[PDB]
A paper describes a structure:
The NDH-1 complexes belong to the NAD(P)H:Quinone oxidoreductase family that includes the complex I (NADH dehydrogenase) of the respiratory chain in bacteria and mitochondria. The electron delivered from Fd is eventually transferred to PQ which is bound within the NDH complex.
We first solved the structure of NDH-1L complex purified from T. elongatus BP-1 at an overall resolution of 3 Å. Interestingly, we found that the NDH-1L complex binds a PQ molecule at a pocket above the membrane plane. We assume that this is an endogenous PQ molecule, which was trapped in the cyanobacterial NDH-1L complex during purification, as was earlier reported for Escherichia coli complex I40. In the NDH-PQ structure, we modeled a PQ molecule in a pocket (PQ chamber) at the interface of the membrane and hydrophilic arms.
Numbering used by the authors:
A (entry chain G): 1 to 170
B (entry chain Q): 2 to 45
C (entry chain E): 1 to 101
D (entry chain F): 603 to 655
E (entry chain B): 8 to 495
F (entry chain C): 13 to 132
Write the structure that this text describes.
């Protein structure tokens, strides 16, 4: 670990700690605007993680959509529903929170067991740095039908989200 | 039960649960005794 | 070993999204947890496309499609949250217990 | 009295104990979506655990 | 492979129909609602009519390993298109009566139809995901379409919650399948690249099974279904109980026989548990439902358990029994939901107690709902008797005795809550009739869309009564769609 | 294996460009009036007290503009690898991307015709 792989491991562990800390701040924080900004922190650190594993177009897409468009939309809707609700704690809060914690820890223990147990078929060939050209070749190849169906998905999502978030004063 | 306790069939304490229980075990026990006896005494 | 660290981080992000999908009182924090789940899946996909499939990077195309569909799903989810906020003027998930048994 | 009480009690009890398990199994679906996703994730865990021994 | 774009011509015709309906309601507005339902009907009929030349073709895997145009996918595409055709025939007066636009409704519905029809044949993991979430997002938007109602908004929110959680679980399973098979996304390539059970393949299997059984509404994942079918518009829940469930079963047959033909005993044990407890909890909780839509939800869960009987057997006749039961279940459930639509349009109510005394007011509605609910119960001359007969015939063949016994017992339990509705409509006295039936309107099929309602009702009732004894062409049409299933 | 070239400067320039507002604010906070034993903490409100309740109006235009931004942002990120890999793809990929662009043009016509692109 002279200087390059040392920098890659230090960057990976810093961005992994940033994803973990900011995602816990998305869940375990009382102020919902802090969750709505730490979500953008999660997305930015995940984009850095994608930069580490040779996916630069997908990292730029992660910045452009999740930080640039999805987090902005989430912040707009958070300012739209911004009130001063009391949120009185229900007496059966144990049945939700302790059950949720033990289910999340069980799924994490199971996933860690199958991740550390599986003989993954690691490649020795280095990956291609030219990711966007192969993704553009893939979009009009194997992945052409999802590429055409995503337009119909976006059109339907725009239709329904214009319909449901509208006022019809007639 | 009260619709059966009128006229000719009119007996005090017939629809009581103790009398129904003892008559049930008597009747259905003679049923089970006759069935077990038929499976044992009769051949084929 | 470096792929298993990416997968363990993605599993931890998925379980942090799970605790919070089923815990949060605010209906928008549930969608934030859903976005955490989708980004955990995308971490799995980009790690698999790096360490196993580096030449033909099909996991990155998969992750592009997951990002682009998750954007539209969060958009229509915030539409549904605004539609439920217009009638009932809360966003609390404990006040949406009307369709019980 | 045996016929109207005991044998019809077995018949009406068969028809009754299939009615109170659905007037008491509908409370498993209680209106909370986060409880429903908790049931989904508990099902995922239970089916993995029971599908591996 | 090589691109074969002549395969997609049903879905291409339906995407063009979607675009024409949307552009017509953008150009003309609400007065475009006078002819665009009939144009969407003609487009769905054209998709089904273009499926007929494709039935006499080979397997012809269409795109670059991304689509299968065999008879199984063609059967499921015709099933989802017929579900949307009946849904459009039901939602002409109902959507216009709520003040909502019909064109945007029809475009979201046709997007759900092309999502289901793309699920019906799908080999890429990403095409499976994109079509599954096209169907899912269109179903969330159709669920809360009547957004002035609190129940529709609540049903849409708790449907999007459960659906997004199940989608992310399905995606974690798909990402694990992409990693476990090396770098493959096509389902035969995944089947070739992994051929032995391991911890991680079972995890991906159960994750995918959860994401699929959300659409199936199996019993630990059924809990969205009663709330959604109580809250959403009734033609939306007709489509969700027929076409969405058929798309989920198409996904199950396409996925578990292609991506997992190695852990077949594991997912057969999983779907055995799902079928057993789905039949049980679907047929005993519908005894206590007092709304017709919630009773139809729990009955739909029970019917999903009956279909999973034939799915879990794993023989050719079992898959054929599942296909034939989905085919007749289309007719009987669209007829039942058409009658629920036609009663709620005239009375504005949904409770089963409010159906009392309908025999003398609206005799066609009682004949329709009686024939379709008794066909759902398994009454001999109708279609569902023969569907259950095939589902138990195939299931006693491959030794699944306990599932067939449980299916017969829960069908006997099912008879009670169906015959309660038939008892309300037919048996109840004129002096015991309800307040909705006392103030019943004059039966008039001329308002806006009650004549397509009557046409769809007559067609589905003639189907669900006559096509049990004329089932041999349906048996021949189904049993050639099973030769395209691996291992038979 | 990290094969991307040019990102060894991206991390360092991200660090230094993140430190330049930090160093600017720290150099401001070092040499500054540490003052004010009475109310620094006042809102502006055009010269006087807060007038008219501390709220703004719910307006769904903030949702609609960000929603159409999400849709056409996803459109442009799909169009980027088609655009850069255009010299290696023939007329058929142009027709398929034309179908994509035409469906989202119909989406833009829907967002225009229904009053979703409005005042703010
Ligand atoms: C200021 C301190 C911050 C940067 C310190 C790194 C210095 C070490 C070094 O020289 O190489 C550093 C290595 C070598 O890169 C190498 O850069 C090479 C460049 S090239 O021949 O040399 O054009 C490239 O070929 C090679 O694949 C690659 O390994 O590059 C990295 O590790 C970059 C990782 C940072 C990415 C995260 C950004 C998002 C958060
Ligand atoms: C895709 C092919 C079809 C595109 C054109 C669609 C036809 C629209 C015809 C409008 C109906 C006739 C006039 C109705 C009367 C009417 O109200 O129309 C006016 C309509 C909305 O304006 P309003 O009057 O309702 O509101 C006041 C205006 O100041 C705000 O728009 O504006 C449009 O026409 C939108 C056109 C979109 C054009 C999109 C082009 C994008 C290309 C890229």
């Amino acid at each position: 670990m002279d200087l390059a792989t040392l920098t890659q491991t230090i960057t990976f562990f810093a961005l992994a700690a940033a994803v973990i800390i900011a995602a816990l701040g998305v869940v375990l924080l009382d102020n919902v605007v802090y969750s709505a900004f730490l979500l953008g922190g999660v997305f930015l650190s995940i984009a850095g993680l994608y930069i580490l594993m040779n996916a630069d177009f997908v990292s730029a897409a992660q910045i452009l959509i999740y930080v640039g468009a999805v987090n902005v939309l989430i912040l707009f809707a958070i300012m739209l529903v911004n009130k001063r609700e009391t949120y009185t704690p229900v007496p059966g809060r144990w049945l939700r929170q302790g059950g949720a914690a033990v289910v999340s820890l069980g799924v994490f223990a199971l996933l860690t067991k199958m991740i550390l147990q599986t003989p993954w078929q690691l490649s020795s060939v280095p990956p291609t740095p030219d990711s966007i050209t192969t993704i553009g070749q893939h979009f009009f190849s194997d992945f052409l039908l999802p590429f055409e169906l995503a337009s119909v998905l976006l059109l339907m999502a725009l239709i329904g989200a214009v319909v449901l978030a509208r006022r019809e004063l007639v | 039960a009260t619709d059966f306790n009128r006229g000719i069939m009119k007996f005090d304490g017939a629809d009581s649960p103790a009398m129904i229980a003892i008559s049930a075990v008597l009747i259905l026990g003679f049923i089970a005794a006759l069935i077990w006896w038929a499976l044992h005494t009769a051949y084929a | 070993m470096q792929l298993t660290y990416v997968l363990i981080l993605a599993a931890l992000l998925f379980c942090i999204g799970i605790y919070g999908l089923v815990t949060s009182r605010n209906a928008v924090r549930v969608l934030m947890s859903i976005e955490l789940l989708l980004n955990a899946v995308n971490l799995n996909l980009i790690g698999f496309a790096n360490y196993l499939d580096g030449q033909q990077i099909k996991g990155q195309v998969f992750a592009v499609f997951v990002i682009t569909v998750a954007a539209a799903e969060a958009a229509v989810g915030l539409a549904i949250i605004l539609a439920i906020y217009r009638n009932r003027d809360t966003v609390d998930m404990e006040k949406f217990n009307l369709l019980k048994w | 009295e045996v016929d109207y009480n005991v044998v019809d009690g077995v018949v009406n009890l068969t028809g009754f104990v299939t009615m109170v398990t659905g007037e008491g199994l509908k409370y498993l679906q209680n209106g909370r979506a986060q409880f429903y996703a908790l049931i989904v994730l508990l099902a995922v865990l239970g089916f993995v655990i029971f599908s591996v021994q | 492979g090589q691109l074969n774009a002549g395969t997609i011509l049903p879905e291409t015709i339906l995407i063009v129909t979607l675009l024409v309906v949307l552009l017509a309601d953008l150009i003309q507005g609400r007065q475009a609602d006078r002819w665009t339902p009939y144009f969407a009907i003609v487009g769905l009929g054209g998709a089904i009519a273009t499926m007929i030349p494709l039935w006499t073709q080979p397997a012809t895997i269409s795109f670059f390993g991304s689509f299968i145009s065999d008879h199984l996918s063609l059967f499921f595409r015709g099933l989802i298109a017929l579900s949307a055709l009946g849904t459009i025939l039901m939602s002409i007066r109902y959507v216009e009566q709520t003040g909502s636009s019909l064109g945007e409704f029809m475009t979201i519905l046709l997007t759900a139809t092309v999502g289901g029809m793309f699920i019906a044949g799908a080999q890429e993991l990403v095409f499976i995901f994109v079509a599954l979430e096209t169907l899912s997002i269109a179903s969330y938007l159709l669920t809360g379409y009547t957004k002035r109602d609190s129940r529709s908004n609540e049903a849409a929110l708790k449907y999007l919650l459960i659906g997004a959680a199940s989608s992310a679980i399905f995606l974690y399973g798909s990402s694990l399948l992409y990693g476990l098979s090396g770098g493959h996304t096509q389902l035969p390539a995944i089947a070739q690249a992994l051929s032995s059970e391991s911890l991680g393949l079972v995890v991906a299997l159960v994750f995918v099974i959860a994401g699929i059984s959300f659409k199936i509404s199996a019993v630990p994942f059924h809990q969205w279904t009663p709330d959604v079918y109580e809250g959403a518009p009734t033609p939306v829940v007709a489509f969700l109980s027929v076409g969405s469930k058929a798309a989920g079963f198409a996904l199950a047959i396409r996925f578990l026989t292609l991506a997992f033909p190695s852990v077949t005993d594991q997912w057969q044990l999983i779907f055995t548990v799902l079928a057993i407890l789905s039949m049980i909890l679907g047929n005993v909780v519908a005894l206590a439902q007092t709304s017709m839509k919630r009773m139809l939800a729990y009955s739909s869960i029970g019917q999903a358990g009956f279909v999973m009987i034939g799915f879990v057997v794993g023989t050719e006749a079992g898959y054929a029994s599942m296909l034939f039961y989905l085919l007749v279940y289309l007719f009987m459930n669209l007829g039942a939901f058409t009658c629920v639509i036609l009663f709620s349009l005239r009375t504005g109510t949904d409770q089963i107690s409010e159906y009392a005394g309908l025999y003398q007011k609206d005799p066609l509605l009682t004949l329709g709902l009686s024939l379709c609910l008794l066909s759902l119960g398994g009454i001999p001359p109708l279609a569902g008797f023969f569907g259950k007969i095939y589902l138990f015939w195939a299931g006693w063949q491959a030794g699944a005795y306990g599932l067939v016994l449980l299916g017969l017992l829960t069908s006997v339990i099912s008879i009670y809550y169906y015959i309660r509705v038939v008892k309300m409509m037919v048996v109840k006295e004129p002096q015991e009739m309800s307040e909705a039936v006392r103030n019943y309107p004059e039966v008039s099929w001329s308002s806006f869309g009650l004549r397509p309602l009557q046409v769809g009702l007559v067609m589905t009732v003639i189907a669900t009564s006559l096509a049990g004894i004329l089932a041999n062409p349906l048996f021949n049409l189904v049993n050639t769609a099973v030769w395209d299933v691996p291992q038979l | 294996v990290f094969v991307l070239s040019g990102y060894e400067y991206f991390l360092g320039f991200l660090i230094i460009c993140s430190l330049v507002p930090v160093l600017a604010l720290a150099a401001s906070a070092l040499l500054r009036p540490k003052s004010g034993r009475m109310i620094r903490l006042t809102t502006y409100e055009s010269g006087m007290e807060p007038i008219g309740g501390a709220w703004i109006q719910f307006n769904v235009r903030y949702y609609m503009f960000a929603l159409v931004f999400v849709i056409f942002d996803v459109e442009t990120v799909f169009l980027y690898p088609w655009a850069v890999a255009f010299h290696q793809l023939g007329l058929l990929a142009f027709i398929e991307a034309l179908i994509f662009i035409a469906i989202l043009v119909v989406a833009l016509v829907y967002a225009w015709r229904k009053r979703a692109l409005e005042w703010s």
